[PDB]
Design an enzyme around this catalytic site. Structure first.
Site, PDB file in Angstrom:
ATOM      1  N   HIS A   1       0.824  -1.217   0.000  1.00 54.89           N
ATOM      2  CA  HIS A   1       0.000   0.000   0.000  1.00 54.89           C
ATOM      3  C   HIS A   1       0.859   1.269   0.000  1.00 54.89           C
ATOM      4  O   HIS A   1       0.335   2.368  -0.090  1.00 54.89           O
ATOM      5  CB  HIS A   1      -1.061   0.014   1.132  1.00 54.89           C
ATOM      6  CG  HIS A   1      -0.488   0.137   2.517  1.00 54.89           C
ATOM      7  ND1 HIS A   1      -0.192  -0.958   3.303  1.00 54.89           N
ATOM      8  CD2 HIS A   1      -0.137   1.223   3.245  1.00 54.89           C
ATOM      9  CE1 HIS A   1       0.327  -0.556   4.446  1.00 54.89           C
ATOM     10  NE2 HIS A   1       0.369   0.764   4.435  1.00 54.89           N
TER      11      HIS A   1
ATOM     12  N   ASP B   1       0.399  -7.900   1.556  1.00 49.42           N
ATOM     13  CA  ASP B   1       0.790  -6.494   1.584  1.00 49.42           C
ATOM     14  C   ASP B   1       2.302  -6.388   1.655  1.00 49.42           C
ATOM     15  O   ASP B   1       2.874  -6.090   2.710  1.00 49.42           O
ATOM     16  CB  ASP B   1       0.144  -5.802   2.788  1.00 49.42           C
ATOM     17  CG  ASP B   1       0.285  -4.291   2.744  1.00 49.42           C
ATOM     18  OD1 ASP B   1       0.656  -3.754   1.679  1.00 49.42           O
ATOM     19  OD2 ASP B   1       0.019  -3.643   3.781  1.00 49.42           O
TER      20      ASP B   1
ATOM     21  N   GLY C   1       2.475   6.493   9.106  1.00 45.14           N
ATOM     22  CA  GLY C   1       3.815   6.951   8.781  1.00 45.14           C
ATOM     23  C   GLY C   1       4.845   5.858   9.032  1.00 45.14           C
ATOM     24  O   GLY C   1       6.022   5.989   8.664  1.00 45.14           O
TER      25      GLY C   1
ATOM     26  N   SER D   1       4.086   2.502   8.196  1.00 42.60           N
ATOM     27  CA  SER D   1       3.833   1.455   7.201  1.00 42.60           C
ATOM     28  C   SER D   1       5.079   1.109   6.397  1.00 42.60           C
ATOM     29  O   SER D   1       5.872   1.997   6.059  1.00 42.60           O
ATOM     30  CB  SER D   1       2.760   1.882   6.235  1.00 42.60           C
ATOM     31  OG  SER D   1       1.469   1.432   6.575  1.00 42.60           O
ATOM     32  N   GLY D   2       5.266  -0.181   6.136  1.00 39.21           N
ATOM     33  CA  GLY D   2       6.417  -0.626   5.382  1.00 39.21           C
ATOM     34  C   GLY D   2       7.663  -0.832   6.209  1.00 39.21           C
ATOM     35  O   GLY D   2       8.603  -1.471   5.762  1.00 39.21           O
TER      36      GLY D   2
END
Ligand code: CA
Lengths: 56, 222
Positions: B40, B84, B174, B176-177
């Site tokens: 995402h 994801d 902020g 994410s990933g």
């Protein structure tokens, strides 16, 4: 009218700046979008926002 | 990161910032030219920033490298958030103490394993406050059953929960990933959750151990 809905950040945790039409202010404003499950009052630019929702 | 602590300059060498004119997601450096993040977090024009601590000022240890390729998992489902995961190839290889890669896991981690989660995301559960420096959080991996109890019908075999049922400690917008490192191996990718630090609503992470084969092969054929 999706232009009247409040901005939706969603469950994902990214910090992506998007635009939403703020009917109270009569303008498109920025908000933080999480990256997934966007609703319709979520635009990539102020121009797209004004074009779609401007004057609602 | 809500309820965490200041990691300390470059103590998490594999942590990267994905920049599109501003920080929007984190990621992990797995080798000198590849970064793993969340699907995402896909955006065009991504610049990867390595060796970062204070994301607002240039301190000298940084390396900004544009992405040449961004590969989202072929089975990523934007609705269910299943799979994801995304791989980003750097336009040029990074110069590897402040910038280092993190190892992929040999096996999956069990519930109860303590892990380090990091990022430059929001530090308030109710409210907004983005840090300048990198924040850290030690959180344990939770069981599949409690995770499924917290999010009925939303947890797939490719996700795991981590955190505290009490709330107050979690990853947030902020982050994410970003990495979830356990025993020196990359076990998870910050993905989603119901709000942040709420509670009975721990954060959900992409289960990296299920993608090791795909990652190694995709890196090698691109
Ligand atoms: Ca910096």
């Amino acid at each position: 009218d999706f232009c009247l809905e409040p901005p939706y950040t969603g469950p994902c945790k990214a910090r992506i700046i998007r635009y939403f039409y703020n009917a109270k202010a009569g303008l498109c404003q920025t908000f933080v979008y999480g990256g997934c499950r966007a609703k319709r009052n979520n635009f990539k630019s102020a121009e797209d926002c004004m074009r779609t929702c401007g004057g609602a | 990161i809500v309820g965490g602590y200041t990691c300390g300059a470059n103590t998490v060498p594999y942590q990267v910032s994905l920049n599109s004119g501003y920080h929007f997601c984190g990621g992990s450096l797995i080798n000198s030219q590849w970064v793993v993040s969340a699907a995402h977090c896909y955006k065009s024009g991504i610049q990867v920033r390595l060796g970062e601590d204070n994301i607002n000022v240039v301190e000298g240890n940084e390396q900004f490298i544009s992405a040449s390729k961004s590969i989202v998992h072929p089975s990523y489902n934007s609705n269910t958030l299943n799979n994801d995961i995304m791989l980003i190839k750097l336009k040029s290889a990074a110069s590897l103490s402040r910038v280092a890669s993190i190892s992929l896991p040999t096996s999956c981690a069990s519930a109860g394993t303590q892990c380090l989660i990091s990022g430059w995301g929001n530090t308030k559960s109710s409210g907004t406050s983005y840090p300048d420096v990198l924040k850290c959080l030690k959180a344990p991996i939770l069981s599949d059953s409690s995770c499924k109890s917290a999010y009925p019908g939303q947890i797939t075999s490719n996700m795991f929960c981590a955190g505290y049922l009490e709330g107050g400690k979690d990853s947030c917008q902020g982050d994410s990933g970003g990495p979830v490192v356990c025993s020196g191996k990359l076990q998870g990718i910050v993905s989603w959750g119901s709000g942040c630090a709420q509670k009975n609503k721990p954060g959900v992470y992409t289960k990296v151990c299920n993608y090791v084969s795909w990652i190694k092969q995709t890196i090698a054929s691109n």
